[PDB]
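Notebook entry, cofactor series.
This is the third protein in the set we're modelling with a bound small molecule. For this one the ligand is adenosine-5'-diphosphate. I'm keeping the input format identical across the series so the outputs can be compared line by line later. Sequence and SMILES below, as received.
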Amino acid sequence: RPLLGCIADDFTGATDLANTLVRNGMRTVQTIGLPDVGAVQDIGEADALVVALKSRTIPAVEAVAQSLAALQWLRAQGCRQFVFKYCSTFDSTDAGNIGPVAEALLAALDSDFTIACPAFPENGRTIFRGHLFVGDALLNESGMEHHPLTPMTDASLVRVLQRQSKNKVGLLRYDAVARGAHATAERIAALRSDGVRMAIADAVSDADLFTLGEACANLPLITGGSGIALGLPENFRRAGLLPQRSVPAIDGPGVVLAGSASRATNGQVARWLEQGRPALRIDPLALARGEAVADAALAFAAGHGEPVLIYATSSPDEVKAVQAELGVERAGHLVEQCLATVAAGLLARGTRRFVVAGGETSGAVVQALGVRALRIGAQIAPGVPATVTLDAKPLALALKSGNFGGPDFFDEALRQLGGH
Ligand SMILES: Nc1ncnc2c1ncn2[C@@H]1O[C@H](COP(=O)(O)OP(=O)(O)O)[C@@H](O)[C@H]1O
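Returned structure with ligand:
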């Protein structure tokens, strides 16, 4: 039976986590929400299950409800330990949802403690004295202070998490972690005795992540980004529970759908345009006026024999202007809906390869495509695997978290997903 059950707050994050688990020796299946029985095939044969939710920015009560339903489903499949997966940049607001979901999951597991560790050195995220760094910049000087939905203006994760948590948030500091697994486990026992119910965990290296994983072998719930999962397969191997343990190219029409406003995604769009590749920009203000923007994007894609880029990707100043006119949630949802409609339309027209930039964007698109589950293929860039659906004629998807990938990612992804 499956050993590890994971709940991810966005669809790109689900693939990121599953990639890390597969690469470290756990057969993993990603489900899009909860599958009907037995709509997903060789699922009781997985070592790990990753449930993808679109719950990062919905109301906290709904995020909790969806997360509790996923937890029960995972328990019923036989899972022994659980991971709550959120963004390595801690994407949230004072209203949630990292705090409300983690605390709800702890209560439902009857556990009095977990860690919260979004560190991801491979993608430049480290944590020191509870403060999150992106490269050598604090979170709030990294570009995340300009995220369209969850601007992060405070790098102190203890303070940030405490604001969205009812119970005591503490710190598992780098100097304990540096001393190895036994010392870390001892410090966790001390934090619990101190009344800490959730601790931000420092991690300045992949070595620290493996130390944390081993120290937390005995916790029902672990929370963080994909990095905190690095060492979990080794725990099960050591315990004698898991033995020591691809995907085909899919040819056909492709498309790139970009709803992230990140610097990385801006750079990826600019590169596409630099190379003279066909692209159409989505104006949120046209969507709000009810102009036929999705139809135009479909027509644009249909007239091209090569993949096109449909993008709303814009500068922070441009996003701010749109939001002042329409509202943050309304603008964000119009764009998501548009890209999702374009994806559904393209699916009907035979498109088989989809590269999607943005977490929420991927949630919208993949739900509109009707995907029930994904098989995890090879890593394209840190945090971003190629994936395929389980249909007789599969779809190939690359769901790129907004901050991930190099400048050339769109082309790299299209090529790894398959041929023309
Ligand atoms: N030009 C724009 N104006 C307003 N909102 C936008 C614009 N472009 C993108 N957005 C919205 O910003 C949000 C980006 O979130 P997401 O897709 O999760 O990206 P990321 O992975 O970078 O966090 C989406 O709701 C998207 O629709």
